[PDB]
Amino acid sequence: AHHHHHHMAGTVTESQFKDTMSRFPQGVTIITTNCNNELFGFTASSLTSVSLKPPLILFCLNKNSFSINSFQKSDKFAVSILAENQIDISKHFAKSQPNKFTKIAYELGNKTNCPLINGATCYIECNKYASYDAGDHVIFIGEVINTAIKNDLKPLLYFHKSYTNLQ
Amino acid sequence: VTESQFKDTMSRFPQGVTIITTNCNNELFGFTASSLTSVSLKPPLILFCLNKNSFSINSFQKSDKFAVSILAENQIDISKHFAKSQPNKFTKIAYELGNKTNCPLINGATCYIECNKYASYDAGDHVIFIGEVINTAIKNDLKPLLYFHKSYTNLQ
Ligand SMILES: [Cl-]
Ligand SMILES: [Cl-]
Ligand SMILES: [Cl-]
């Protein structure tokens, strides 16, 4: 059967990890900031609600991303939850390149001045609340200071390493 | 920001549904969680968040390991059960205690994950638990349970 034991090392490979975690479905967001009047953003599915009182959310960003320094230095960010018809937006922001916003329809949020992506199902503005190293990423926790639900369009899903939709 | 605007807006982000468990001195604990996310590839880390007001919180704080079962679309009843606050949640549940952690993995789940606790952090009215993945298994090819707009639903 089994007995009382302590820490075991395990045998999991990276591919096993990726394949397994791909089977947790998630929405798709563009997360942005404005650092010394320069715009940065990336495609993020690691969003989650964290706390109600105070109202907190988090996301995770790779230490090796072009974006990381800006989020580290900036005290604010914004989140746009993508609709089903926004795959092109999702792919564009997932591509590492400077000046991601030249051809993109966006508005600056009222409370953070961070870009919100037109067409998104809804918008979230945050002040940065805390920040933690975690393996090869950093976890950013935001306090939600503004929200707007923009439309009833259905959300983009990411599942099994691919884009899909709700029923 | 009102509680309603926060909760209703965040409900727009769809998530899967998991049962997260630990075994603390041979006593089994678990709850239904949609906060799961991947955190790191090297090392392989995931996190979840648990309310400080949950019955389970002490057991997760004290136990240095946990497990996660990703629920299939036919497991709404299991999701509701583990969301219900009460002792002895496993009495009539089909599980298997994980090989690496002895934490319960829920039969019929699409995927099993075992973690050692890597870190944890206070975050407003929750605790963020980070786990290093030390075992995984893909158990079936069923489609995942989704939770969206405060309702259970399905992929297309
Ligand atoms: Cl919450
Ligand atoms: Cl990752
Ligand atoms: Cl049940």
Side-chain angles (χ1 to χ4, degrees), chain A residues 2-3 5 7-10 12 14 16-21 23-29 45-52 54-58 60 81 122-124 129 132-137 139 141 144-147 149 155-157 159 164-167, chain B residues 1 3 5-10 12-18 26 34-41 43-47 49 70 97 99-102 111-113 116 118 121-126 128 130 133-138 144-146 148 153-156:
Chain A
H2 70 89
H3 48 75
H5 72 239
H7 183 292
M8 296 297 159
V12 69
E14 283 189 354
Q16 281 161 354
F17 171 75
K18 287 170 73 79
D19 291 356
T20 301
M21 297 310 304
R23 285 139 197 282
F24 185 68
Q26 293 175 306
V28 188
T29 71
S45 282
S46 79
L47 192 97
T48 191
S49 294
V50 174
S51 177
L52 177 54
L56 306 174
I57 65 169
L58 66 77
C60 304
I81 294 180
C122 58
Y123 298 150
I124 301 131
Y129 177 87
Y132 305 101
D133 186 62
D136 59 26
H137 282 55
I139 297 168
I141 307 178
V144 168
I145 57 169
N146 197 22
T147 66
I149 295 149
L156 187 56
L157 277 284
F159 171 70
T164 192
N165 303 303
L166 299 189
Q167 201 166 238
Chain B
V1 166
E3 286 182 28
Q5 90 187 82
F6 176 69
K7 279 162 147 173
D8 296 351
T9 310
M10 292 308 291
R12 297 312 197 268
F13 185 75
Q15 290 175 306
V17 178
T18 70
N26 301 125
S34 284
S35 73
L36 180 73
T37 183
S38 294
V39 177
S40 167
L41 183 60
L45 312 174
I46 65 173
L47 67 67
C49 308
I70 303 183
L97 304 186
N99 181 257
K100 305 309 185 195
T101 61
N102 285 330
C111 297
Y112 293 167
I113 307 162
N116 288 323
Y118 182 84
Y121 301 105
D122 236 79
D125 64 18
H126 288 50
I128 300 172
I130 307 173
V133 174
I134 61 167
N135 203 18
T136 65
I138 293 148
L145 187 57
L146 274 286
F148 165 73
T153 190
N154 302 136
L155 298 181
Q156 172 186 256

Side-chain angles (χ1 to χ4, degrees), chain A residues 1-3 5-10 12-52 54-65 67-72 74-75 77-94 96 98-102 104-106 108-160 162-167:
Chain A
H2 70 89
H3 48 75
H5 72 239
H6 285 62
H7 183 292
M8 296 297 159
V12 69
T13 68
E14 283 189 354
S15 154
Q16 281 161 354
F17 171 75
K18 287 170 73 79
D19 291 356
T20 301
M21 297 310 304
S22 80
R23 285 139 197 282
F24 185 68
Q26 293 175 306
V28 188
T29 71
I30 304 310
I31 296 189
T32 66
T33 195
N34 176 341
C35 184
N36 264 53
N37 298 124
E38 194 180 9
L39 308 182
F40 305 81
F42 70 103
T43 301
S45 282
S46 79
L47 192 97
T48 191
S49 294
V50 174
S51 177
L52 177 54
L56 306 174
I57 65 169
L58 66 77
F59 68 90
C60 304
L61 176 54
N62 202 301
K63 269 139 78 162
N64 77 13
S65 69
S67 294
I68 188 74
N69 202 27
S70 67
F71 285 96
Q72 291 274 24
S74 185
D75 284 313
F77 61 90
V79 179
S80 307
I81 294 180
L82 297 183
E84 280 187 359
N85 63 350
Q86 289 184 303
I87 287 173
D88 278 4
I89 291 305
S90 175
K91 299 180 170 163
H92 173 89
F93 275 103
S96 189
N99 297 313
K100 297 192 181 175
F101 294 86
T102 61
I104 295 289
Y106 67 86
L108 300 189
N110 301 328
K111 299 255 152 62
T112 66
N113 216 31
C114 291
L116 301 169
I117 303 295
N118 284 69
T121 68
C122 58
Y123 298 150
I124 301 131
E125 289 191 283
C126 295
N127 288 330
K128 177 163 63 193
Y129 177 87
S131 202
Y132 305 101
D133 186 62
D136 59 26
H137 282 55
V138 173
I139 297 168
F140 296 90
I141 307 178
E143 180 169 14
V144 168
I145 57 169
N146 197 22
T147 66
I149 295 149
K150 301 304 298 189
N151 57 59
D152 294 332
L153 300 180
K154 282 147 60 102
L156 187 56
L157 277 284
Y158 199 61
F159 171 70
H160 204 351
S162 65
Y163 294 105
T164 192
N165 303 303
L166 299 189
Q167 201 166 238

Side-chain angles (χ1 to χ4, degrees), chain B residues 124-152:
Chain B
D125 64 18
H126 288 50
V127 173
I128 300 172
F129 290 94
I130 307 173
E132 178 161 3
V133 174
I134 61 167
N135 203 18
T136 65
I138 293 148
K139 309 303 296 187
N140 63 49
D141 57 4
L142 299 175
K143 290 142 58 53
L145 187 57
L146 274 286
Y147 198 67
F148 165 73
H149 206 314
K150 314 188 289 291
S151 241
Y152 293 101

Side-chain angles (χ1 to χ4, degrees), chain B residues 76-82 89 92-93:
Chain B
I76 283 180
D77 285 359
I78 283 257
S79 181
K80 298 200 169 155
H81 176 76
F82 278 98
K89 297 191 192 183
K92 306 187 78 76
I93 292 305

